[PDB]
Write a protein that binds this ligand. Structure first.
Ligand SMILES: [Cu+2]
Ligand SMILES: [Cu+2]
Ligand SMILES: [Cu+2]
Ligand SMILES: [Cu+2]
Ligand SMILES: [Cu+2]
Ligand SMILES: [Cu+2]
Lengths: 332, 332, 332
């Protein structure tokens, strides 16, 4: 009887941060209540000032990471304010039935809905908007995020020993398909309906114009670089709702990686680069061993360094000359 | 001595259906006899009426699924009728030697050949035509299928317990590269030889114009939707002879997935989306838990919803409100 | 104390060959000394005579395979002769810290540097040049290779039994993005600086013009085909520094495959095709069972047969008619 279960309301946070949670379940199964408000907004996605009409969950690309435990119930109140122009919904890859909830959550502007589903499978999973006839447009406009369903006894390694993270970050990778004129400049549009056929044409090329982390070129750099300390165990959750990606920590590794994100499977060990298929979330665990700057990239290096799929970690602590040293510094 | 083994003749069926077979071998090793007739034919592949010259095994794209057990012999009689215009052959990824049989099966129109090979490795495997100098043209014109080699004691889960399916479907995913003029309209051709250089040019773009299941946009929808009942265990075999794909059951999961199709390996559990590399067949097992419509898609959603890589399951049975429910239906 | 360890100097060889090494470590940990000299040179990459300005480690594309054991130290002297024009460096995916060494190895023409790192994780790993602001240009101009870090007790199968190879080959797969004019012909450039923006434009299309093994179309064919004998156990290491690939041995299999290259993980068994993500090296082990010609390809068959990603094995020995035979040779 679900009415007899504890309810807990979660207040979500902006990626790449993640709301507070317990890795090992400190309660029995609960109904975990989330609220997200859809926001259609202009977003500047690159250094040139290219501005698109983004479709977001909770004002961000990606949408926030939701975190529950296996066999919790997820209850989501989805709000589509009358300041928006489009119909939206939500599909959870974690859920079973009704197109992941999409069939039950169609909200016109000025409407809201509440969906409840049982999180029966542990893993990281994509969620995204999926309105009938317009699915890839919404998804490639930013309307996706992820949900992590932790095993009730937390994460385990390939031998069944606990893996406990000290920090968790969520990197949502977004492929945008900004329509171009024949000279190659980005086109700009007066209404969503007037943009639609050109959006479809741009998507059909299958060639993204931008591939970004946390919604824009350089979003995870500078004052917004990810941080860690030598010796800290960090879990990076990475999602891509539409297109394959291949994350790589430049200077590091994925010590334990669930490339397709599902925690009943033993992790892959010692990965340099891992493939997260389009429509999947993955998770990588690493213990930092050296200080300094790391780049976290999609290792199609064109996608990383020309199209935007690169962020930074800044790591504090002691340098280990046993692991790496310059013997002879560059010289004539 | 192969002459002392039982022979069994199989009558193949059109995808997505699969010929009758036993999951657990009820006989010792056998010579399993198949016959396929090559058919070059016009096929309408989309809702616009785009018509291509398809090259098929047995009149279908994909070719039929063949099913044998490990250490059976597969004996194929391949017929190229004099009504065809091209040289064809067959390469089995399940076979060992002679380019998978391709070197031994070159049949001009009006010729036939019979190949026998030992199915030494259990899994789902691609087969395709591969004529010297013309390989990707034949494959991307539809001339591919798959063969399933079951373990003699049937499928097993990650712990070695039996997995028995109630139903099996074969989804062949086909990438077509229809030549376009500079305005972007599809070109139409008077002879294969006159089409060839433009086919090569179109392929070289590496951008398919269509990506379809069972040979056409919408082929697995409507009266031809896949079916199941709540509680039925379904195995979906999925092949792609040329290009990576990422299957996803919208509203469901891959409970047990062999993404690269080889049954000596433990399956991946609880998958949302799985990556089947180009030139591979994969297999996913799911037990339906909810009724209604499911979409089975390539989760590059542009490929699914704009280029054609989407089918439907219609599932009968009882709705489970514990797994999913609308708490508050969409309202103002 | 690293000064108390044995030092061993390795003399590298040109791919696809690999320098001599022991699979099982016959000494304790060592400092393994390598030297590579950067060479910028013109390379003809296709049958049409398309000539690019390649950037190489040691004069080859790919760079040579380095082979050490887990917990050895790798000491590399990198030389950038004054006959080159560009700044280069080296990033090892096997290393920990300083962007894989890239931050410590920036060498202008006329400079050299020596880097030492501890090879703490067993596997095959990519190395590549990665100069700040120019990374994908150098990598896609050929400046990448791989390093194999063997477990001290050699390779093991999924049950922990030894796997010993008789022969090893290194196949580096290179994606080139040769700039094209609007008619589609390759453009040719007077200086690197004058080529740069067009190189960037070509890369941004995300569509390689050439995808080659060992630096050119047909490099691993004819007198340079890979060789083996029936019954020989062969390990093929395959890297791709920028783009996903899907190797396949036509007529064979990957008996044991580490698709993402890391030997602490059990191998995948009986693979037809495997996915090596961009920025990764993988390794496949096969025991030949049939003589003749095999094709080793990227199984996007357009990439293989139109863009160049195909090589040959020539295998000597006895034909096994039990595994495959022509029953009825092609006839009217
Ligand atoms: Cu939406
Ligand atoms: Cu989805
Ligand atoms: Cu053919
Ligand atoms: Cu093939
Ligand atoms: Cu360089
Ligand atoms: Cu790298």
């Amino acid at each position: 009887d679900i009415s007899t279960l504890p309810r807990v309301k979660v207040d979500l946070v902006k990626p790449p941060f993640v709301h507070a949670h317990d890795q090992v379940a400190k309660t029995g199964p609960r109904v975990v209540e989330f609220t997200m408000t859809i926001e259609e907004k202009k977003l500047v996605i690159d250094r040139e000032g290219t501005e698109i009409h983004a479709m977001t969950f909770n004002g961000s690309v990606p949408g926030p990471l939701m975190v529950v435990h296996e066999n919790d119930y997820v209850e989501l109140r989805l709000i589509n304010p009358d300041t928006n122009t489009l119909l939206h919904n939500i599909d959870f890859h974690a859920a079973t039935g009704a197109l992941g909830g999409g069939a039950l959550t169609q909200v016109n502007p000025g409407e809201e809905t509440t969906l409840r589903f049982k999180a029966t499978k542990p893993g990281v999973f994509v969620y995204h908007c999926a309105p009938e006839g317009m699915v890839p447009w919404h998804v490639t406009s930013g309307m996706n995020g992820a949900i992590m369903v932790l095993p009730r006894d937390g994460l385990k390694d390939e031998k069944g020993q606990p893996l406990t993270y000290d920090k968790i970050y969520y990197v949502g990778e977004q492929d945008f398909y900004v329509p171009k004129d024949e000279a190659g400049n980005y086109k700009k549009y007066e209404t969503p309906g007037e943009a639609y056929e050109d959006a479809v044409k741009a998507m059909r090329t299958l060639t993204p114009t931008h591939i970004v982390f946390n919604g824009a070129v350089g979003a995870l750099t500078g004052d917004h670089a990810l941080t860690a300390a030598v010796g800290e165990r960090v879990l990076v959750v990475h999602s891509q709702a539409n297109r394959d990606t291949r994350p790589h920590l430049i200077g590091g590794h994925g010590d334990y990686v669930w490339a397709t994100g599902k925690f009943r499977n033993p992790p892959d060990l010692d990965q340099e680069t891992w493939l997260i298929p389009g429509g999947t979330a993955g998770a990588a665990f690493y213990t930092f061993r050296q200080p300094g700057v790391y780049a976290y990239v999609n290792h199609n290096l064109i996608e990383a360094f020309e199209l935007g799929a690169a962020g930074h970690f800044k790591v504090t602590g002691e340098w280990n000359d046993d692991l790496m040293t310059s013997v002879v510094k560059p010289a004539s």
